[PDB]
Amino acid sequence: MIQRTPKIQVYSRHPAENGKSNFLNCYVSGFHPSDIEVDLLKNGERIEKVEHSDLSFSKDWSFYLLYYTEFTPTEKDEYACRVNHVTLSQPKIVKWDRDM
């Protein structure tokens, strides 16, 4: 059995403008096996309404998924993605940086 830890990127669909609706994305890739837990967080709290793409994989057999939710960014609201996988000793949090 070959295991691989996920790469994680957290970003918006469109350039962020405060007070305008958008989509918050967390793209997880390069992982094996396929079982993975991904939450989007708003000020540290789990966002209830989150959708995801259908499980697919790359040339190297490693999996990828896009998790996404519609949201309206503001000045002061902080967003993040929290991921757990068998390869991680604890959950990994990546903060949304509007410039990354």
Partner: protein, 274 residues
């Protein structure tokens, strides 16, 4: 440019937690067009791009029949492989299969693929000549002999060189407005001061399709990779893709650096400077 059609199939056993879950997805280039999920409501192959809705009921019935049969073969395979590798009935395991074809700018056959993985590593693969097999290990030799005796390769060759190529052409035609589009990247550069001593230049590419793109840094018109970071190309969620490349530079030296962008939607490659 060139195009591809690819199907991806994954099953995972979870002993004591029901029978295996199976997911199948089909793509033309970077655009998903069909899906099947063995635990979803419909129990049918389902559309995921507008142009595939041009297909009539015989198509949906046939594609559903084939994908359900494939789910059942993956179920049998999980059992077979546990046997081949002398494994316990207690662990979870994964089978994956991918196949499809590539065509060039003239829409003629370039290559075909048909390959299988068990637990995250190669198991068996059709070679490029579409006549012979690469077995990854001793266990896989058993499957190689089985498939050689049943003339699987010849059947796959006919599909890959024939049906696969023809149906890829049909889809490209039917979905021309979207599949044959080239959305050139919207590009810009940002600057952030790491300290008084260094700054980060970041070259952005947004809203592009297809996913293939090249971003490169140069210093004094010479290729530079040291002190650079390149992120994996990522989906925006709206059918387009995003990517950036960054370089860390000494303060006062930003003007020596250029970012170079190559994409099929561009008539000539772009150069950006701060």
């Amino acid at each position: 440019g060139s195009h591809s059609m690819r199907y991806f199939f994954t099953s995972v056993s979870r002993p004591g937690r029901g029978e295996p879950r199976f997911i199948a997805v089909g793509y033309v280039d970077d655009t998903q067009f069909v899906r099947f999920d063995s635990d979803a409501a419909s129990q049918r192959m389902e559309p995921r791009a507008p142009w595939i809705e041009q297909e009539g009921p015989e198509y949906w019935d046939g594609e559903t029949r084939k994908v359900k049969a494939h789910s059942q073969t993956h179920r049998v395979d999980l059992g077979t492989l546990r046997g081949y590798y002398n494994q316990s009935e207690a662990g979870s395991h994964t089978v994956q299969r991918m196949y499809g074809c590539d065509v060039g700018s003239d829409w003629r056959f370039l290559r075909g693929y048909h390959q299988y993985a068990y637990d995250g590593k190669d198991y068996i693969a059709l070679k490029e000549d579409l006549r012979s097999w690469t077995a990854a290990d001793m266990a896989a030799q058993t499957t190689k002999h089985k498939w050689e005796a049943a003339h699987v390769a010849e059947q796959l060759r006919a599909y890959l060189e024939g049906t696969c190529v023809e149906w890829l052409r049909r889809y490209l035609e039917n979905g021309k407005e979207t599949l044959q589009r080239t959305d050139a990247p919207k590009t810009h550069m940002t600057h952030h001061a790491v300290s008084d001593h260094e700054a980060t230049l970041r070259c952005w590419a947004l809203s592009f399709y297809p996913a293939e793109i090249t971003l490169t840094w140069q210093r004094d018109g010479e290729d530079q990779t040291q002190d650079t970071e390149l992120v994996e190309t990522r989906p925006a969620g709206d059918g387009t893709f995003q990517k950036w490349a960054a370089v860390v530079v000494p303060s006062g030296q930003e003007q020596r650096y250029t970012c170079h962008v190559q994409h099929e939607g561009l008539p000539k490659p772009l150069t950006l400077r701060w």
